[PDB]
UniProtKB/Swiss-Prot annotation, chain A:
Matching SUPFAM superfamilies: P-loop containing nucleoside triphosphate hydrolases (SSF52540)
PANTHER family attached to this UniProt entry: P-LOOP CONTAINING NUCLEOSIDE TRIPHOSPHATE HYDROLASE, PARA FAMILY PROTEIN CT_582
Binding sites annotated in the UniProt record for ADP: G13, G15, K16, T17, T18, P203, N205
Catalytic activity: ATP + H2O = ADP + phosphate + H(+)
UniProt subunit comment: Monomer in the absence of nucleotides or presence of ADP, in the presence of ATP is found in a monomer-dimer equilibrium. ATP-binding is required for DNA-binding. Probably interacts with Spo0J.
Protein name per its UniProtKB record: Chromosome-partitioning ATPase Soj
């Protein structure tokens, strides 16, 4: 069964963090105990939740107990990114299972891993520790162009590094239905990957970008906005696919 | 003087590639001989210009002649990314000056280096080889939040790795003036960094995102669109700053 879900895509700015935060927010509202782990050196998920920490996931890898590293936020827990992740990108080379072996998260129902836009050791650790992968794909050309290669890479990972890793689903994000490009991109994704693509599409709406500046999830910042409804529906879909 | 300009920002999707391609397009139209080097493993600048090559910057780093690796596109030259760059990220670790030493680009007026969203050896090589840096900053919160740290990192590089590296300017990108968020972000950027922020703001306009799907620059795809006018004005501003 799927417990750990990685939000991954080496393409930058396709909604990995926004999805990790808001998926956690609505999964928590479904009564699930959720842990959000920020593995990006940039630490956007952490900053977007109003947290500034000196200890986080980096220290978990150094033997520190999980319980004393988490921060309570909007109904779930966050294992924060710290400036140490910069060096961790190098230190973890050759150690892709480090996170998997340090994640004593049995107390949680679901664990979300937010990865940086790369195939660095941090992203590899996320993929090696996860059971399912949600791939956010921005409704534009560059993001669409990288899917084929991205899916092949996930297969390489499942080939030996993590045999139980599976694609939970492809999520169309930052979708503006008024543009032909967004329509054409969603169409190509559903034509080639069919059921792999989530039904729910995340629409482009500025409240989603505003939320982080207040350290709030979309459920806290604009509970009735298009993005809120979209992520609420996604949480339901995710649970359906996990079951 | 400034010849090599890096388009860098570890924040993903802030317009590095879109800016590198369109800036090259308008600099070429100003009569400049331009070379665009795609250092991102993703290879978006390459794909966005309709190029699919088996040899590129990786082979340049191996010692192969630059003139036999470039592709002519929209009036300028492209030194393409190749699947070999995935392994280059690991190969260049410890060799931050590899690109600088291999860039025999004296035949070009300007050289643009498109870096990936990270501080990997590829981005480091870009910073160690460039004289100026154009930092694209999406008009939203996350991009704004990273600027301080980014400028600090640029200073570190100048403090040792590359003393000639200088911030050419901060470019506000994907700006939708109809949103209060975009307005507040540009306002804060100019309040905190003033003159460092380019006058030219790139507006959010879908044709800029469409162009790459046709392997065309915005100057080819939609020359009279908001994005095209913006990048044309930017090319002029960059030249003005390069001359200063
Ligand atoms: N649906 C949306 N509508 C509007 N703004 C959005 C939406 N999804 C995300 N954003 C904004 O777009 C930007 C890019 O998203 P985000 O930072 O989540 O991507 P990643 O997390 O994909 O990026 P990176 O590659 O840097 O880790 C952010 O400024 C974010 O607030
Ligand atoms: N001003 C704009 N208006 C509309 N779309 C834009 C604009 N600038 C760029 N885009 C689109 O936004 C996405 C992100 O831009 P781009 O890929 O150039 O960023 P980077 O090059 O910042 O990304 P990465 O971090 O992955 O290298 C692309 O799909 C691009 O086509
Ligand atoms: Mg992110
Ligand atoms: Mg890019």
């Amino acid at each position: 069964k799927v417990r750990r879900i990685a939000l991954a895509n080496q393409k930058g700015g396709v909604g990995k963090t926004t999805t990790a935060i808001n998926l956690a927010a609505y999964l928590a509202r479904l009564g699930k105990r959720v842990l959000l782990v920020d593995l990006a050196p940039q630490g956007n998920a952490t900053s977007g939740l109003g947290v500034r920490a000196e200890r986080g996931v980096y220290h978990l890898l150094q033997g520190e107990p999980l319980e004393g590293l988490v921060h309570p936020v909007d109904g779930f827990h966050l294992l924060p990114a710290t400036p140490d992740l910069v060096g961790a990108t190098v230190e973890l080379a050759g150690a892709p299972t480090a996170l998997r072996e340090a994640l004593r998260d049995e107390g949680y129902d679901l664990v979300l891993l937010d990865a940086p836009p790369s195939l660095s050791p941090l992203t590899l650790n996320a993929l090696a520790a996860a059971e399912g992968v949600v791939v956010p794909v921005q409704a534009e050309y560059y993001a669409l162009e990288g899917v084929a290669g991205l899916l092949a890479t996930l297969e390489e990972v499942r080939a030996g590094l993590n045999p139980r890793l599976r694609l939970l689903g492809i999520l169309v994000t930052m979708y503006d239905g008024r543009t032909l490009l967004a329509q054409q991109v969603e169409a190509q994704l559903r034509a080639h990957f069919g059921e792999k693509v989530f039904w729910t599409v995340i629409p482009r709406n500025v409240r989603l970008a505003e939320a982080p500046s207040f350290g709030k999830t979309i459920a806290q910042h604009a509970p009735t906005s298009p993005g809120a409804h979209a992520y609420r529906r996604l949480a339901e879909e995710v649970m359906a696919r996990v079951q």
